[PDB]
Ligand binder design. Structure first.
Ligand SMILES: COc1ccc(S(=O)(=O)N(CC(C)C)C[C@@H](O)[C@H](Cc2ccccc2)NC(=O)O[C@H]2CCO[C@H]3OCC[C@H]32)cc1
Lengths: 99, 99
């Protein structure tokens, strides 16, 4: 679909068997989800945003459905205030800022 | 134009007579620019992102040129790590997400 930006670009995602809402975020290199129960092994990572840094867990090769489009990639899990879908997954669903 | 997301969606802006680069940021409600010299009155504001909060100066009715598109609106100025163009200005230049 085409999505305009008068409101937050929120979409429905399915990940780890669970349904969540997340913001399509072109300003985010990586994908960051609030604390959730994911199955696999993870690695420590620290990521920086506008007000400082947070500790997250890095999960690779995670299947996520984003507004009906399947993608597999890295998902970071930790104390983000909002679920954000970053460019790493946006490119997979063919998302652009486009005409 | 169309912009894909394999790389950061950086564009050239002109504001306050100065040229800068900024990230087109669908995950940002507001526009936040790094410390710069901007004409006139402003108000204190506190904004939150991934790692906490920063203090910014809020300037209203500011003319900004974003990739050759003129817009007028609120620009926040403060210790953001990256110049970010948020939805407040993205809607003015007719910018959409598509996939
Ligand atoms: C390592 O991978 C990363 C590295 C960094 C990030 S990020 O989230 O911190 N960030 C990078 C940017 C600052 C360069 C993306 C950015 O879009 C961020 C995403 C976000 C975070 C928290 C709440 C809502 C939205 N937006 C942001 O901080 O917005 C501020 C400023 C603009 O106005 C408001 O809009 C809502 C909150 C407030 C993600 C993955």
């Amino acid at each position: 679909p085409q999505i305009t930006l008068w409101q937050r670009p929120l979409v429905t995602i399915k990940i780890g068997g669970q349904l969540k809402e997340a913001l399509l975020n072109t300003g985010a290199d990586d994908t960051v989800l609030e604390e959730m129960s994911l199955p696999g092994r993870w690695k420590p990572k620290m990521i920086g945003g506008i007000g400082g840094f947070i500790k997250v867990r890095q999960y690779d090769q995670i299947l996520i459905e984003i507004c009906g489009h399947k993608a597999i990639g890295t998902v970071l899990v930790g104390p983000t205030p909002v679920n954000i879908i970053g460019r790493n997954l946006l490119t997979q669903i063919g998302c652009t800022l486009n005409f």
